[PDB]
Design a protein around this ligand. Sequence first.
Ligand SMILES: [Zn+2]
Lengths: 300, 389, 148, 320
Amino acid sequence: SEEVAVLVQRVVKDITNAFRRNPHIDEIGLIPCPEARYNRSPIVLVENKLGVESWCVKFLLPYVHNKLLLYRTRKQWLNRDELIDVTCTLLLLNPDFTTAWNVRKELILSGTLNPIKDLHLGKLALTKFPKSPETWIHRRWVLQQLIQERAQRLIQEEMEVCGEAAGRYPSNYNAWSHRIWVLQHLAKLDVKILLDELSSTKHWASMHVSDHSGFHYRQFLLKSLISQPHLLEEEVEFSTDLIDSYPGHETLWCHRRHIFYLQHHGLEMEHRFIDQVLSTCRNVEQARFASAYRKWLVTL
Amino acid sequence: GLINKKLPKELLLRIFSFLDIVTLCRCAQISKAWNILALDGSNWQRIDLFNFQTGRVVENISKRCGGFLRKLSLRGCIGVGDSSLKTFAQNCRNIEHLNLNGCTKITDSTCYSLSRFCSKLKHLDLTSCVSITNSSLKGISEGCRNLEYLNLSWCDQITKDGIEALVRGCRGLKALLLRGCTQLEDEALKHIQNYCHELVSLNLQSCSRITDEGVVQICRGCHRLQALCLSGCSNLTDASLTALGLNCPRLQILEAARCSHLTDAGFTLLARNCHELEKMDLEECILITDSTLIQLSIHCPKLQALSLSHCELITDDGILHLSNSTCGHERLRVLELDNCLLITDVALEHLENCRGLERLELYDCQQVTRAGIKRMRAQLPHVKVHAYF
Amino acid sequence: PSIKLQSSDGEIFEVDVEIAKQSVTIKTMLEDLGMDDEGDDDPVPLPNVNAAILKKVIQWCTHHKDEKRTDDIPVWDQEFLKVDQGTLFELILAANYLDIKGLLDVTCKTVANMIKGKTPEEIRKTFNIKNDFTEEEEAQVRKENQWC
Amino acid sequence: KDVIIKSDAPDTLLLEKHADYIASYGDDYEYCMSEYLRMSGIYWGLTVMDLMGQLHRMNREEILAFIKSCQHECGGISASIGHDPHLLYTLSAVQILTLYDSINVIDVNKVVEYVKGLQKEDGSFAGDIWGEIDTRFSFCAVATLALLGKLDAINVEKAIEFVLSCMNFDGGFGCRPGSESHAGQIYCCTGFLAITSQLHQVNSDLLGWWLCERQLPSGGLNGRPEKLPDVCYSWWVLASLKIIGRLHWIDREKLRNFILACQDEETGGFADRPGDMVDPFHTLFGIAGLSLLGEEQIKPVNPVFCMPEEVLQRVNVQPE
Ligand SMILES: [Zn+2]
């Protein structure tokens, strides 16, 4: 009860020292390990991955959680180094703890936290909590401080982080929401970025046919290109191929709707596609979605 | 009330001496006895504010107290900015102790107020007052020349030019804390040894620009040093260790975590001339071998607390020496041997002679068994030993 | 390494000399005493502490090997100090007489905690202090001291 | 793609077990993992209990003390003691206080000042001082102010205009302009447009069409295309359809069977989906959804505010 406090401090120290030994750590995970059976740290570093042995987490999060609250509540002081390290450990364990992120915002405003350090923190928490809403929210707050070419390196690292978080979590709304935001506020809808994203991301959509967030992101790319032809046609053909190769995905038929809606700013070709689909299809889901597409089609 | 019948004024004031200002004002409303007690001078001596951000309090205390405010802690009161502290300063000229730790909205403007109105300051804590520049140290050097204690921790935009201005006026500093002032270099160390000959305590943690040139100078200029922190100062060598031994016979505390280059040569020279060492933190002094501990067991009879974390080369041998120290038989209480991979159960049997040990750390010492721990706890129930088990 | 202590009422207590020199007063008396071979092994006289208070003190000293602030008391001490008001005041006096700064801090912080978080009449009720202020004076003081 | 309802799925409402479950709900590790939303957790649990005629089972006084102890000097309310204030937990605490008719145990004026202060010049609202924009916050803002009778305290026309710029061409809404449409967000905006009397700028046929395609063959509702059905998204989709009067566009019976199939017959509580573990969050939305489909053992629920309609009538009959 007092031997545990020492242990939790030790494990906090072990996490910080992991990052000194390897500042290229790029992933964290929980190592299922309910028993402390040897005198080794529960912090296991193998190559670039940082594993945390589960037996210690039941001690580590309540202590670091309450340390942060006792600080915030003005009953126990933490200095700058401890703030940074206590909140680092909390966000590794529970990145939806907004108060923990908010303490780093202040540390960043005061100048003692390099913002780039929080971009790395979020990136690593996102390897374990890819949908974490607060982490994305914090990450946008940091990014907007850094805009008040380094932009392109930021934009480019956001695309990869969002890509990483989308591959780790099915239909990751928050990852793609963040990716949209970045386009809006960091790239300000730069037409060549929208183009490079449209091409980079066609591969990813090919591989994630049931993921509607990814297709909406392509929908966003195209609409935003509009607001500044061959791209729409090539997106309908892409949808024709995907619908044909992977019958029965509501995401693909929903994508074709959105994309065909934009192209319509003719419908016989789309009727015959629905006719040809419904005549020769074995998938029962595919028939639902094709019949559903036509009821949508005729209200035009 | 029993309280008044059994406890005399001297003790009642001790009770009230633990009370916030809000609670102290309510006791003033209890009785005529408790009124004279609630407002007695000794209760308005020190204020530690534990309040809400949304300030005027510091300004209202400045009036209700005024002349007798001597110590004022505002640690973590992000509410306060220059305006409140101007008002408090012009009303509390006898203040001897000001703690502004973490008060982030503090500008050069308040050190100017302090210079104008608080010439009796002996203790200024500026930890994490990030908006403070070199100019603040110039103002403090003009109006706060009796300063004995200054803490600039994590005041990262302070440079050698501020340090120079500060010590050129505050020649009487006995304690100077500069942790996390990463722009400080050897010239700033040289301004310190030039002017702060009465320096007892110096913190240079994470001031990793400094080198032996600066540290050796500090030892030449500060012969009264008792406490020195150089953790994170990777550039240092045994040369700084030789200069310490030669110049600082009163050394009690030496923190040199992460100083990789330090070797037995340095520590033998240090040990023989420094017979008053009590704390030594040598975490990640990898080159250190059992020989370093040998000299410590001979030449350091009052050694109190030793960290050998990550000193991989340390073996059960050096631990036997420590335990057969004059310091080990009674005056060692804290020993940290974690990530000393060679330490075994035998070292825990050695340290059964250390009847004074309160705290033993063995994290990542994989040769150490649950059995060894249990028999050490059994011989020394005084000791809390700490491993991952 | 054990000494005998005699309380005010004549009961004698065997106490280890180490846990007992947490008392600066007791350590003083030992230093004053011998250094004596030829005595009658008389205990250390403690005329200003009775056996019940001593008991509580020795138990407090055995449990310990080991800022205007009261949220600070360890939980063993909090439990230890859940006594009637009379004995806790006696423990303050004892801690002061015997100069046990740890015990005098927790006990004073404990009485201080009984005052915090209450209204003036909640104070006078806890400690049965008679309010000797007229409404004129009570209104006044809840005047100056009111700022807040 | 979907769940399959087993032949032994609960087909009737087990009100007493749900009230026992919520009444005994309550470990230290996972208490800390959840504390960042404690206020709303309490709102789910109190609200389902009052919908079930069981609110008296709960400790009114420790709740009100907790809320009183969560208002910061800026006026905003945090999820727990010592957490930072956020609009989400200010809505929750105000909902809780509305259930307990104890709105005035906190400083209503400073709550109003806190909400008002989060609006931005384009009409949008931030969730707290740090400035995250979300239509969920436009909803939380007007819901809190409506409950306090203080909708005039913000710029309503700007707030409406902003929310309308989040309308997608598919009829839905997301967190911001350009966002993917999303049932939870559609619920917030729909609820926003109901509190502020602007539902007529919504193409009800478009939105209700997007919404009714959330029903899967199992009867359950998902939150977006090709997601599993979910009790919580079932409630938000059902609530939205009620608000826009397109509730006849889903099969209410199959959805009722889906929600009922999410009860645990042994423990009480609803899971997100049959087979999964129950929690108080889905317990509220399961019971609220059933009240909306016509379960007469449950008090009628308001679709905008997720509270007993009786509690909002008490609000709407006043100075107001
Ligand atoms: Zn759900």
